């Protein structure tokens, strides 16, 4: 009854995706008319958005001024009447269950059974139980067992997992053995920052534009591994190393490394340094203290 860390068993789900987005195309096409191939599926699924430290959202202002009813019964069934027969053509090619699914989603009914609930393989089900016991043990502070789970798992050939935040916080709270959360993260960036879809929201990502969660969390959490101190020029040495320019958060990490190193003219250069990176961190989507507060610490320094 929980998400599975495997690529979903295939055929029928994909041909259903076909029927769905194809009919979607015909209805929305005729809709814009009335307002006036893997690749066809690709363009189709394509043109669509794919007191505490709250990474705040974008609130409501500078947005439209309503709409008034577009869709009566007669007018909708006008738009619907034709694309449903076009659908009658390839429905004849798909399977009877698939056809039924097309009929029901197109009535607007939502299917009883999940993709998992109708899925149907030994090795993958075993990996499912393995990974599950990993996540469970890591939740249970059972770092020993959890470590055994992790080693036995990574042994397997079967699936790569984005599951990466699972292992970041996993090895993090594990402390037990294996080349740790930082090693995993910098591995993620080294393998997936070069040319060398379904599964992917933001908490696991590709290094064209922002890989977010794991990177910023090893960044901050490493600066807290300096809270262990009072390592920094290391953390910002390998935050210096990568080019993935849409961050700024590593600009505030950088300027935080300079404020932490500023705690004689050397200390001056560190304070001018943080003064610089706070503005080249006004470069991008802002991380802001009132920042006259940042400067006020910097004047407590100017003492």
């Amino acid at each position: 009854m929980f998400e599975v860390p495997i690529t979903l068993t295939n055929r029928k789900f994909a041909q259903r995706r076909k029927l769905k987005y194809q009919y979607i195309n015909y209805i929305s096409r005729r809709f814009d008319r009335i307002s006036k191939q893997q690749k066809k599926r690709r363009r189709e699924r394509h043109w669509r958005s794919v007191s505490f430290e709250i990474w705040r959202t974008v609130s409501s202002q500078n947005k439209q001024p309503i709409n008034k009813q577009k869709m009566t019964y007669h007018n909708f069934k006008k738009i619907e009447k034709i694309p449903l027969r076009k659908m009658e053509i390839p429905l004849l090619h798909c399977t009877k269950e698939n056809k039924l699914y097309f009929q029901s989603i197109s009535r607007g009914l939502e299917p009883l059974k999940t993709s998992t609930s109708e899925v149907r393989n030994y090795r993958t089900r075993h990996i499912v139980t393995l990974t599950d016991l990993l996540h469970l043990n890591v939740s249970r502070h059972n770092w020993s067992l959890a470590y055994k789970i992790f080693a036995t798992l990574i042994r397997i050939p079967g699936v790569q997992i984005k599951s990466l935040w699972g292992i970041g916080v996993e090895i993090l709270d594990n402390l037990s053995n294996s080349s740790s959360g930082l090693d995993f993260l910098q591995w993620m960036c080294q393998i997936y920052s070069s040319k060398s879809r379904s599964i992917v929201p933001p908490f696991q990502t590709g290094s064209r534009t922002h890989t977010a969660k794991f990177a910023i969390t090893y960044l901050w959490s490493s600066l807290i591994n300096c809270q262990k101190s009072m390592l920094i020029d290391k953390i910002s040495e390998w935050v210096l190393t990568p080019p993935f320019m849409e961050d700024a958060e590593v600009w505030f990490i950088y300027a935080s490394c300079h404020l932490l190193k500023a705690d004689i003219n050397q200390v001056i250069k560190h304070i001018h340094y943080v003064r610089t990176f706070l503005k080249i961190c006004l470069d991008k989507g802002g991380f802001a203290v009132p920042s006259r507060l940042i400067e006020n610490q910097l004047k407590s320094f100017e003492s």
């Binding site: 090795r123 139980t129 016991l133 042994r155």
Partner: protein, 377 residues
């Protein structure tokens, strides 16, 4: 690269090879008799001769894995060995007997049409096994060629011990058995088709045995006008049956519960405990090495970054003994409740163990229950 249109020959070679591989594992690791192998060459020989008495270049064969298990059970049943379908289901779902792959990860590259003809239809779990053994029992005829009487009485023993029933129920159910059948049990349910709709939910002998077993318990216990079986000991029986304890067997039934199609049994894995999960991951790293299908050395060092790395739990007759004792205190209309919950737990175990459906079982025991009322009234 790969064969075209006469990879019938290669297909039947990976298939036959996989069969003899499984036989190797069951004489070796299950201490079968060497005669089994000859019985297998005879049955696989009969149906091989029947599919090579068939013309078409269009293959029309289905050598799914259910056919492997089908001729193994067929041969075992001729030889009157006390192995039953649930032995096979357990054996294969616990990765002991190699099954869930084409020529498991290590072989041959065949036309993807046949790799699909292998990997497909893999599950036995809705009675696919009973249906495929009856189908083979048509494909070459059971009657004259072989002796298709099931090993009934060992199944009764297996069943009483599988519950914690006192040995009187072996003779009880053996008697109801004799009452409706007089002990004649066949293997074919064949009239080659898909089509069937009455008379033939219940003519795989086993399923009827389980049906008689259930019935027996219900009748027997609900009409002990003697009061031989206490209103309590039915509860204590239910609880000694219910207490999840870690023997090879129950651990196995958990492993089968994981790949049984229907809920609840997966909610059953939900209600398991850290040691069950642990021995599970153990069986995962052991028997899911029987898996299927620069950067590589980078993953040998990458995985080699984190280390790959007075006997506690008890045997079968130990557990059996101890619940037989847990009820050893042996010497009013809501006792029907105790009868019902006991029957339904027993049912659950049978459903996962004999890979059938809730609805399948109750169809059978319903039909054959009316088949006893009819020859009783």
């Amino acid at each position: 690269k790969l064969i075209g249109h006469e990879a019938k020959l290669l297909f039947l070679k990976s298939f036959q090879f996989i069969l003899k591989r499984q036989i190797r594992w069951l004489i070796t690791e299950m201490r079968f008799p060497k005669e089994f192998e000859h019985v297998a060459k005879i049955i696989w020989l009969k149906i091989l001769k029947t599919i090579n008495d068939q013309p078409q270049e269009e293959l029309k064969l289905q050598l799914h894995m259910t056919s492997t298990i089908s001729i193994l059970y067929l041969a075992s049943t001729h030889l009157s060995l006390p192995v039953y379908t649930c032995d096979y289901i357990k054996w294969i779902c616990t990765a002991k007997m190699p099954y869930f792959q084409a020529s498991e990860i290590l072989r041959i590259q065949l036309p993807n049409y046949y790799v699909s003809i292998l990997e497909g239809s893999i599950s036995p779990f809705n009675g696919q096994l009973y249906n495929k053994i009856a189908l083979t029992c048509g494909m070459i005829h059971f009657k004259e060629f072989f002796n298709s009487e099931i090993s009934c009485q060992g199944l009764l023993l297996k069943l009483v011990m599988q519950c914690a029933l006192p040995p009187e129920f072996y003779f009880y159910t053996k008697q109801v058995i004799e009452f409706e059948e007089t002990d004649i049990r066949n293997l074919t349910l064949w009239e080659r088709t898909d089509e069937r709709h009455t008379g033939r939910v219940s003519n795989h002998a086993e399923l009827r045995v389980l049906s008689y077993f259930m019935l027996t318990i219900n009748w027997m216990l609900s009409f002990d006008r003697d009061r031989q079986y206490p209103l309590k000991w039915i509860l204590s029986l239910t609880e000694s049956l219910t207490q999840r304890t870690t023997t090879s067997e129950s651990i196995g039934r958990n492993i089968v519960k994981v790949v049984y199609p229907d809920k609840p049994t997966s909610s059953d894995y939900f209600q398991w405990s850290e040691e069950e999960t642990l021995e599970f991951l153990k069986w995962m790293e052991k028997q899911f090495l029987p898996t299927q299908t620069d950067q590589k050395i980078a993953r040998r060092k990458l995985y080699k970054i984190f280390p790959l790395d007075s006997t506690h739990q008890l045997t079968f007759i130990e557990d059996l003994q101890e619940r037989y004792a847990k009820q050893t205190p042996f010497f009013p209309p809501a006792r029907k409740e105790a009868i019902g919950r006991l029957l339904t737990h027993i049912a659950s175990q049978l459903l996962v163990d004999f890979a059938i459906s809730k609805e399948q079982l109750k169809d059978c025991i319903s039909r054959i229950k009316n088949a006893c009322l009819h020859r009783m009234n």
